[PDB]
């Protein structure tokens, strides 16, 4: 089978002229890691995790380092990961002082009889697993400090989907949330069916945008229902995002990969950084009708 990886940044407004190149490099890097894992025969779960670790470590993206700040100027993160073979999953919410929430979500999946850990319990589990505690300041960027001050005086998670050489599908979603959010606010990112969904019998979805809207419509599972009903990945993505817009006035985006290798990146927001790698080619874009295709050997 031909493996595919699709990655996305936040499903938010227009991006600054010079920030677009840092964003472009970040998306290329995430898709390169994801695809590289797939091309050596790695699993879909390792591919989506690898892609999302890259975006968490990148201060340009709203996950890990570069996470938006809550009302107290702190970084509180959420993440979920799912394997489409057995529907096994791991999720974390309101996590702090760790570099990679998606790796902690992977440890919840592999090392516990549970799939979702939160706040104090997720921090205690991270310590028991030997996950290093990093100072909160190391996750905080200057651009985010300014965003918080701007907001106080008046978006979207990162993710990845993959299809591996064995026919397995997976998704990973990670976020810092929304600027100036309440303490302990949980978005759609750690919630299965909302932040993403992966099932080998259908495909895999990872979403971004206004978390409350994504939660209310169960955006990731809804997209896969349309595929089950015979719609293409493009029709499914349009129908489910269109429904979020009309029903709950929510904007956002998503990436999909079907079990047959069809993929798409769609959004109702102004932009959504995205990249896809398949058959030695890299597809990239931010704005509608700005897609670039290059060789990815």
Q: Which residues bind a copy of itself (CB under 8 A)?
A: 86-89, 91, 93-94, 112-125, 181-187, 191-194, 197, 212, 215-218, 221-222, 225, 229, 247-248
Per CB under 5 A, contacts with Na ion among 25-64 are: 56, 58, 61, 63-64
Contacting Na ion (CB under 5 A), which of 66, 156, 209, 252?
Answer: 66
Three-class SS state of 115? coil
Q: Which is nearer to Na ion, 65 or 162 (CB)?
A: 65
Q: Which is nearer to Na ion, 66 or 187 (CB)?
A: 66
Give min distance, CB of 68 to Na ion, in A: 10
Three-class SS state of 145? helix
Give min distance, CB of 143 to Na ion, in A: 11
Give min distance, CB of 11 to a copy of itself, in A: 18
Q: Choose the contact partner of 192 out of Na ion, a copy of itself, none; CB within 5 to 8 A by kind.
A: a copy of itself
> Is 216 within 8 Å of 245 (Cβ atoms)?
no
Give min distance, CB of 258 to a copy of itself, in A: 18
CB atoms within 10 A of CB 202: 21
Q: Which is nearer to a copy of itself, 96 or 271 (CB)?
A: 96
Q: Which is nearer to Na ion, 66 or 209 (CB)?
A: 66
Give min distance, CB of 275 to a copy of itself, in A: 28
What gap in Å lies between CA 197 and CA 188, rounded to an integer?
12
Give min distance, CB of 142 to Na ion, in A: 14
Q: Is 209 left (phi over 0), alpha (psi -120 to 50) or beta?
A: left
Q: Residue 108 corresponds to which tokens in the numbers above?
A: 């919840």
Q: Choose the contact partner of 186 out of Na ion, a copy of itself, none; CB within 5 to 8 A by kind.
A: a copy of itself
Q: Choose the contact partner of 217 out of a copy of itself, Na ion, none; CB within 5 to 8 A by kind.
A: a copy of itself
What gap in Å lies between CA 282 and CA 16, rounded to an integer?
23
User: What DSSP string describes 248-297?
Assistant: H---EEEEEEETTS-EEEEESSS---EEEEETTEEEEESSTT--EEEE--
Q: Which is nearer to a copy of itself, 114 or 143 (CB)?
A: 114
Secondary element (H or E) of residue 116: strand 116-118
Give min distance, CB of 285 to a copy of itself, in A: 30
Half-sphere exposure of 166 (CA within 13 A, CB side): 13
Q: Which is nearer to a copy of itself, 61 or 197 (CB)?
A: 197
Total residues at the site for Na ion (CB under 5 A)? Answer: 7
**Cα dist. 17→134, 150, 294 in Å?**
32, 20, 21
Give me the residue whose beta carbon is nearest to Na ion. Answer: 66
What gap in Å lies between CA 271 and CA 172, rounded to an integer?
20
Q: Choose the contact partner of 61 out of a copy of itself, Na ion, none; CB within 5 to 8 A by kind.
A: Na ion
What gap in Å lies between CA 99 and CA 120, rounded to an integer?
16
Residues that bind Na ion (CB under 5 A): 56, 58, 61, 63-66
């Amino acid at each position: 089978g031909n493996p595919i990886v699709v990655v996305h940044g936040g499903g938010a407004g227009p991006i600054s002229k010079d920030r677009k190149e840092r964003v472009h490099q970040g998306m290329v890097r995430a898709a390169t890691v994801g695809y590289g894992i797939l091309r050596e025969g790695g699993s879909a779960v390792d591919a989506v995790e690898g892609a999302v670790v890259a975006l968490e470590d990148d201060p340009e993206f709203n996950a890990g380092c570069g996470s938006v700040l809550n009302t107290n100027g702190e970084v509180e993160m959420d993440a979920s990961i799912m394997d489409g073979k057995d529907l096994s999953a791991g999720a974390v919410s309101a996590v702090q002082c760790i570099a990679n929430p998606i790796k902690l979500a992977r440890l919840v999946m592999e090392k516990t009889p549970h799939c979702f850990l939160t706040d104090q319990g997720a921090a205690q589990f991270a310590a028991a697993m030997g996950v290093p505690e990093i100072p909160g300041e190391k996750l905080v960027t200057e651009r985010n400090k300014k965003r918080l001050e701007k907001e106080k005086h008046e978006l979207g998670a990162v993710g990845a989907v993959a299809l591996d050489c064995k026919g397995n599908v997976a998704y990973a979603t990670s976020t810092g949330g929304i600027v100036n959010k309440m303490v302990g606010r949980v978005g759609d990112s750690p919630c299965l069916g909302a932040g993403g969904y992966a099932d080998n019998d259908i495909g895999a979805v990872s979403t971004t945008g206004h978390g409350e809207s994504i939660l209310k419509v169960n955006l990731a599972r809804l997209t896969l229902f349309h595929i089950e009903q015979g719609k293409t990945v493009e029709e499914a993505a349009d129908l489910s995002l269109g429904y979020m817009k009309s029903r709950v006035k929510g904007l956002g985006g998503l990436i999909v990969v079907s079990k047959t290798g069809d993929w798409v990146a769609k959004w109702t927001s102004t932009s959504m950084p995205w990249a896809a790698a398949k058959d030695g080619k890299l597809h990239f874009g931010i704005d509608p009708d700005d897609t670039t295709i290059t060789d990815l050997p």
